[PDB]
Amino acid sequence: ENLYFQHMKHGRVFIIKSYSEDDIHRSIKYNIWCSTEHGNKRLDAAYRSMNGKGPVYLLFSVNGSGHFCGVAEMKSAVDYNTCAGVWSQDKWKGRFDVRWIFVKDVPNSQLRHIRLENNENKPVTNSRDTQEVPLEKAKQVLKIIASYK
């Protein structure tokens, strides 16, 4: 429980929502990801402003699944000019590296009581893709996911 993410000063944490589980599986296999155009720009700015002084974490969830499916750290800036059609749909353009840390399904029931003060106090489980999570709430989510059994 407190073994995980006890030292996570600095850094920023985002929700990732996918409408394709196959895309997630490919992310886990090859340690890469891509968001929407606006989502890519958000993650890119966060990663770049962090300038390596802390981690950028990604909380992954397949839309409609009722569970989060793991955690990865973002590991490069966004390359916007990359091979087309590598994902479930052609609209996913560009690429950045990640490193997956946890691959595990955690029911939303374990997380829905955490609310985002930056998103009208909505449960963290009702977030859209690349919703940023306040650090103290992110620390709570990461610990729950890490320790869930």
Residues that bind ligand IF3 (CB under 6 A): 17-20, 23, 34-36, 87-89, 92, 129
**Burial state string for 94-106 with b = 16 or more CB within 10 A and e = fewer than 16:** bbbbbebbbeeeb
**Residue number closest to Cl ion, CB atom:** 83
**Contact region with Cl ion (CB under 5 A), list: 17-25, 65-73, 74-82, 110-118:** 74-82
**13 contact, one of ligand IF3, Cl ion, none, CB 5-8 Å limit per kind:** none
In sequence order, the β-bridge partners of residue 100 are 72
Listed residue (43, 1, 63) closest to 130, CA to CA: 43
Phi, psi of 7 (to 5 degrees): -115, 90
CB atoms within 10 A of CB 21: 13
Residue 83 touching Cl ion (CB under 5 A): yes
- Residue 127 or 139: which CB sits closer to ligand IF3? 127
Show the tokens assigned to 87. Answer: 């994902």
- Which run of H or of E encompasses 140? helix 135-147
Q: Minimal distance in Å, beta carbon 83 to Cl ion?
A: 4
Q: Minimal distance in Å, beta carbon 30 to Cl ion?
A: 9
The annotation places the binding site for RNA at 17-19, 23, 33-34, 63, 87, 92
The annotation places the binding site at 17-19, 23, 33-34, 63, 87, 92
